[PDB]
Amino acid sequence: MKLAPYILELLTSVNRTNGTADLLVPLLRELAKGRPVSRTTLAGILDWPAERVAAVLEQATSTEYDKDGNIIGYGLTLRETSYVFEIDDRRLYAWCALDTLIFPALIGRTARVSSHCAATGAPVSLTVSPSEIQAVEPAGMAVSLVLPQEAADVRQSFCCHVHFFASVPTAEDWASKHQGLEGLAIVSVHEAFGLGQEFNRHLLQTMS
Numbered sequence: 001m002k003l004a005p006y007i008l009e010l011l012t013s014v015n016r017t018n019g020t021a022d023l024l025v026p027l028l029r030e031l032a033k034g035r036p037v038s039r040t041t042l043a044g045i046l047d048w049p050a051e052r053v054a055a056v057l058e059q060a061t062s063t064e065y066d067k068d069g070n071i072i073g074y075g076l077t078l079r080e081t082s083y084v085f086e087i088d089d090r091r092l093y094a095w096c097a098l099d100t101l102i103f104p105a106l107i108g109r110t111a112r113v114s115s116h117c118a119a120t121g122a123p124v125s126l127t128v129s130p131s132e133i134q135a136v137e138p139a140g141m142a143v144s145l146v147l148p149q150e151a152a153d154v155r156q157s158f159c160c161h162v163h164f165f166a167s168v169p170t171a172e173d174w175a176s177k178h179q180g181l182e183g184l185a186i187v188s189v190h191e192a193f194g195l196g197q198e199f200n201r202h203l204l205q206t207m208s
C-alpha cells in the first residue's frame, strides 16, 4: 500500500521542534553497546551543551532511565519488551516491530530479532541487516502500522500499536477488531522493512 503518510508523519515526529532527529543515531549506537548512557556522555559525543540534550530528552517523554539517572532506553532499550533485538550475543530490546527493522542500518549491525504474534502468540523471528531481512520465520510475517499523532509521544501513540503477526491474514482478522486506531493498516514484514528504509534514508540525509 501507499506508505507515504506513515513515512511523512514519522519524519515529522522526529523533525518536530526539539525533536530527536540529530541525537537519535548517536544515542542508538551508544545504547547498542549494552550499557546505560549518561546525559553528560551523550552531550560530548554530540558536542551539544547540556541544556540542548536536556530539551530534546525532556520532549521525548518516554525515554527510559535507570536508578542512576542514566539513559537505558529510547527505541532501543535495555529494559525487557516483547521485541527482542540481539546483537553480537547481547540481548537488547525495542519498543515496536518497526523499530527492529530500522535500527540495524542506523547502528551498522545485524540483529537476530524475535517476538510473538500479537494475535495468536506464535513465535516469530528474523535476521535484520542494514540492507535486507533473512530467515523470516514464518515466511508470511506481517506488521501493524498506525498513523503517528501530532506532538504526541511516539511510544503510546505509535509504538504500542506496531506489532509483529504470524501472517497477513491472521493480522487482518486482528485489525478488523481495532478500527478505532488512526490509520490502522497491515503490511508484510518486507513492506515494513521498506518503510523503515525510506525513513532511514530521509533521516540520514537531514543529518549534519
Ligand SMILES: [Br-]
Pocket (backbone or CB within 6 Å): 002, 003, 004, 005
Ligand atoms: Br498515499
Ligand SMILES: [Br-]
Pocket (backbone or CB within 6 Å): 014, 075, 154
Ligand atoms: Br521514532
